[PDB]
Amino acid sequence: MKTQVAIIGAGPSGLLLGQLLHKAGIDNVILERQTPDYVLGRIRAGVLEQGMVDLLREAGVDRRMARDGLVHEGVEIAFAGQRRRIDLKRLSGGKTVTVYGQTEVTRDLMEAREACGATTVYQAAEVRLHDLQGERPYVTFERDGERLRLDCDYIAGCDGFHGISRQSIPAERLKVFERVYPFGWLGLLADTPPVSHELIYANHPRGFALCSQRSATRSRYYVQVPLTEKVEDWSDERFWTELKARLPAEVAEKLVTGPSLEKSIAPLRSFVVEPMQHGRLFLAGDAAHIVPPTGAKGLNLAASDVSTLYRLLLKAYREGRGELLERYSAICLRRIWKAERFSWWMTSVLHRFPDTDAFSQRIQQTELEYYLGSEAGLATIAENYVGLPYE
Amino acid sequence: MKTQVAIIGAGPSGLLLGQLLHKAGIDNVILERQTPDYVLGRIRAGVLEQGMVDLLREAGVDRRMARDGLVHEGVEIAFAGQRRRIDLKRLSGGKTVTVYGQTEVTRDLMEAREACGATTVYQAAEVRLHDLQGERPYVTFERDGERLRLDCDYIAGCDGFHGISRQSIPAERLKVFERVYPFGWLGLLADTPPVSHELIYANHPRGFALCSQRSATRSRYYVQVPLTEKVEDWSDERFWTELKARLPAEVAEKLVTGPSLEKSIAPLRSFVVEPMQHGRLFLAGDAAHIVPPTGAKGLNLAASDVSTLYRLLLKAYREGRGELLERYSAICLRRIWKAERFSWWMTSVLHRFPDTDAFSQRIQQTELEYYLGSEAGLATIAENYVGLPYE
Numbered sequence: 124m125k126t127q128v129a130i131i132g133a134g135p136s137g138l139l140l141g142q143l144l145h146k147a148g149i150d151n152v153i154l155e156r157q158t159p160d161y162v163l164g165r166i167r168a169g170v171l172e173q174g175m176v177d178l179l180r181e182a183g184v185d186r187r188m189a190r191d192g193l194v195h196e197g198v199e200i201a202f203a204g205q206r207r208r209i210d211l212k213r214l215s216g217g218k219t220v221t222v223y224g225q226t227e228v229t230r231d232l233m234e235a236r237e238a239c240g241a242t243t244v245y246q247a248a249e250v251r252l253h254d255l256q257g258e259r260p261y262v263t264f265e266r267d268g269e270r271l272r273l274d275c276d277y278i279a280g281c282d283g284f285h286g287i288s289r290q291s292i293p294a295e296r297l298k299v300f301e302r303v304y305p306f307g308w309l310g311l312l313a314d315t316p317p318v319s320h321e322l323i324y325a326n327h328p329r330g331f332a333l334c335s336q337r338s339a340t341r342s343r344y345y346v347q348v349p350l351t352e353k354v355e356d357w358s359d360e361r362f363w364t365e366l367k368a369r370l371p372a373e374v375a376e377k378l379v380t381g382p383s384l385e386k387s388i389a390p391l392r393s394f395v396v397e398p399m400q401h402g403r404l405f406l407a408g409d410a411a412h413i414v415p416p417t418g419a420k421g422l423n424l425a426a427s428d429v430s431t432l433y434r435l436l437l438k439a440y441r442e443g444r445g446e447l448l449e450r451y452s453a454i455c456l457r458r459i460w461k462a463e464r465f466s467w468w469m470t471s472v473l474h475r476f477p478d479t480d481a482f483s484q485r486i487q488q489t490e491l492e493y494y495l496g497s498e499a500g501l502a503t504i505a506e507n508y509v510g511l512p513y514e
Numbered sequence: 515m516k517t518q519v520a521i522i523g524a525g526p527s528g529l530l531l532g533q534l535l536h537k538a539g540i541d542n543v544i545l546e547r548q549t550p551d552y553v554l555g556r557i558r559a560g561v562l563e564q565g566m567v568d569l570l571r572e573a574g575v576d577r578r579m580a581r582d583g584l585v586h587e588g589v590e591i592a593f594a595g596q597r598r599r600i601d602l603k604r605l606s607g608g609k610t611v612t613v614y615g616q617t618e619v620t621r622d623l624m625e626a627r628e629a630c631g632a633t634t635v636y637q638a639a640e641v642r643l644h645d646l647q648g649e650r651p652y653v654t655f656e657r658d659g660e661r662l663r664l665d666c667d668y669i670a671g672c673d674g675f676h677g678i679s680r681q682s683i684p685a686e687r688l689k690v691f692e693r694v695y696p697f698g699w700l701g702l703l704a705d706t707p708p709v710s711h712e713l714i715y716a717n718h719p720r721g722f723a724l725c726s727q728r729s730a731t732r733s734r735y736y737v738q739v740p741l742t743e744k745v746e747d748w749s750d751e752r753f754w755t756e757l758k759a760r761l762p763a764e765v766a767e768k769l770v771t772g773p774s775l776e777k778s779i780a781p782l783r784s785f786v787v788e789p790m791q792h793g794r795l796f797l798a799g800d801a802a803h804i805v806p807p808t809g810a811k812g813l814n815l816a817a818s819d820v821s822t823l824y825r826l827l828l829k830a831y832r833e834g835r836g837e838l839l840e841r842y843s844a845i846c847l848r849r850i851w852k853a854e855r856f857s858w859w860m861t862s863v864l865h866r867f868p869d870t871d872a873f874s875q876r877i878q879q880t881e882l883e884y885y886l887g888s889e890a891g892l893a894t895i896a897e898n899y900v901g902l903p904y905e
């Protein structure tokens with residue numbers, strides 16, 4: 124085998140780049156370690172900004188989304204006492220966000236692909252990247268116990284956080300910026316009516332609480348917990364009381380509980396890599412950067428990454444401007460940091476930090492009461508929450 | 515002696531409350547430890563928001579100010595690389611700030627007072643506050659080695675940070691919030707033309723640098739320095755090179771240097787007290803709270819404090835609503851924290867913090883590049899820099 128752009132990872136990022144390119148007439152090849160249902164089982168994401176939406180539209184993958192995802196013109200911040208709302212739609216000067224699961228997106232790209240007959244090597248083991256700065260790089264992998272070769276012009280490093288991509292870059296060439304938070308998020312999935320027609324982010328003494336959704340009958344809920352917690356310990360019951368123990372009084376009494384489909388804990392990490400390239404290797408999505416799930420920016424960053432990588436592969440491909448690919452990481456990085464800054468900010472103000480003296484606690488509160496109180500303040504949550512312009 | 519409101523401290527705060535009340539026909543008495551030139555020698559303050567201005571106007575102390583202070587419609591942030599400006603005047607929806615030294619203000623209230631013949635006991639030693647929660651509190655002090663008594667209805671605790679006021683409040687009754695920064699500000703006063711018709715705040719690798727003014731021919735300059743620095747070590751020369759080493763290239767070459775009048779180091783502290791009252795004692799200005807000199811909020815907070823205390827003393831005095839004085843600290847505290855939050859924010863982003871990893875450094879930068887780049891972002895620096903509305 125030989126192809127044009129061999130992609131590693133059959134996740135959101137990978138499957139997006141993969142589709143987009145197929146349409147542009149640039150042959151691509153997806154290499155994935157696990158099987159398609161395994162990948163299909165991951166819950167993750169739920170909010171996509173307009174950009175990821177239009178992109179979806181652009182790979183012709185928006186039939187379902189346009190039909191089942193929900194449009195949201197607001198959000199809520201419930202901080203010790205009250206509950207303020209943010210008119211994203213008005214303060215963003217017209218924008219919004221969509222609630223449509225990572226899973227759904229994944230199932231949707233996966234359908235498109237199979238249908239177009241684009242290649243996808245599932246369960247491809249021992250993937251390896253070769254001759255990275257040459258005129259012809261390659262990928263070696265195993266099918267059963269058969270080690271094959273895929274010749275390509277470029278490689279799309281889309282294998283996520285624990286992917287092999289980034290690793291393939293000479294450590295000395297890469298500079299790392301990472302922050303690790305002393306807490307996690309315990310996420311319970313319930314086949315029950317969600318507490319609100321909008322999202323409610325709750326900063327409460329006992330920690331953060333999040334009320335989110337999947338449908339009129341599908342809710343997603345979260346509670347911040349020490350890294351030391353084990354879900355084995357969090358039974359439906361415990362969770363339900365802890366949630367209610369964390370929400371606004373009039374919310375909790377409106378709350379419909381039930382057995383959980385899935386329960387998992389995700390640890391909050393802040394991570395960035397610069398540069399995001401190496402030779403003929405371009406890493407995108409999880410493999411280049413991570414964001415605490417708080418500003419729901421994670422899957423939104425991949426889209427921004429892929430939208431970029433794609434449009435540059437096009438020029439080199441149909442317009443022969445191979446040269447622009449060098450600016451890949453200069454472009455992506457502008458977006459990333461402002462996205463990293465917003466989620467950091469988010470996180471710091473809605474979370475229960477252990478070992479914070481009274482000033483800092485007073486300052487946490489002032490942030491909330493400053494920002495949800497002033498229109499200019501408001502406008503900042505809004506231009507970011509909905510997503511900064513693409514460039 | 516007996517009087518109505520006995521004030522401790524013959525500083526800005528004290529002298530303001532003092533004047534204001536004299537005009538309202540509420541007899542007052544000022545008690546000060548040092549002499550009037552000693553007090554007159556303190557350089558401190560240089561920027562007053564509109565509120566402090568109008569207040570000045572209201573005590574009939576604005577002849578000179580209206581004539582010599584300067585009106586500023588902008589500020590500058592020079593962060594590693596470039597130099598962005600903030601149109602406070604446009605983004606505040608019409609507001610400004612005035613550059614008119616603490617010293618000048620002090621000399622101006624001092625003139626008014628003497629003239630109205632209001633009492634002022636200078637060099638009053640061993641001041642002591644008595645029967646604080648009673649129907650008639652008192653102050654005892656010494657004139658030479660003569661210990662006298664001043665009977666009053668209320669006491670205005672205006673003796674600054676190291677004042678006796680706050681101390682007179684039963685420790686157990688007060689709750690303290692204080693942050694102390696690992697650096698100071700070395701301030702040099704020069705009888706030379708200032709580098710700009712506006713202020714320039716400079717975030718540079720080597721630390722913060724500030725370019726300020728007093729006149730067309732009087733400049734004020736600062737450089738952030740470790741708490742361990744001793745001015746004895748900072749000669750004019752050293753300072754001049756360190757400043758230039760910290761500013762924008764095109765600034766430094768425009769810079770006119772010269773011998774310094776005064777040179778001093780001020781350590782940055784963040785401090786708040788709640789509540790600001792005790793019996794018939796009301797502490798205001800420095801004695802209730804401190805702010806790092808960065809958002810130039812310090813003397814602006816006293817004005818906000820005094821404007822409050824005054825207007826409540828009036829009601830009890832001419833309108834007999836003795837009752838409202840209880841809300842003194844509920845009023846002041848709303849303002850204070852938002853003022854404390856702004857200067858904290860200010861400080862954190864323009865200063866060189868030792869032991870900051872690369873993420874946090876990347877995040878510092880993102881703040882600057884986020885906030886001086888977005889209009890909503892801009893609007894936040896602006897509504898605060900010029901001063902939040904009084905209530």
Ligand SMILES: Nc1ncnc2c1ncn2[C@@H]1O[C@H](COP(=O)(O)OP(=O)(O)OC[C@H]2O[C@@H](O)[C@H](O)[C@@H]2O)[C@@H](O)[C@H]1O
Nearest residue numbers: 132133134135136155156250282283286287408409421422
């Ligand atoms: N060595 C490997 N070879 C091939 N594929 C690999 C390898 N390692 C990992 N992969 C596969 O690549 C995929 C990576 O998926 P994700 O982490 O979801 O990828 P991305 O598209 O970058 O991100 C999606 C979303 O998840 C969040 O973590 C992220 O912030 C974003 O919101 C997984 O299916 C995984 O099995």
Ligand SMILES: Nc1ncnc2c1ncn2[C@@H]1O[C@H](COP(=O)(O)OP(=O)(O)OC[C@H]2O[C@@H](O)[C@H](O)[C@@H]2O)[C@@H](O)[C@H]1O
Nearest residue numbers: 523524525526527546547641673674677678799800812813
């Ligand atoms: N025991 C005492 N008895 C009488 N007077 C006293 C006593 N202790 C202090 N004082 C006097 O009270 C005055 C306090 O002055 P400042 O600290 O300047 O007071 P304030 O009016 O609260 O603040 C002015 C400005 O300085 C900054 O620190 C502050 O943030 C504000 O910008 C000084 O003259 C000092 O000698």
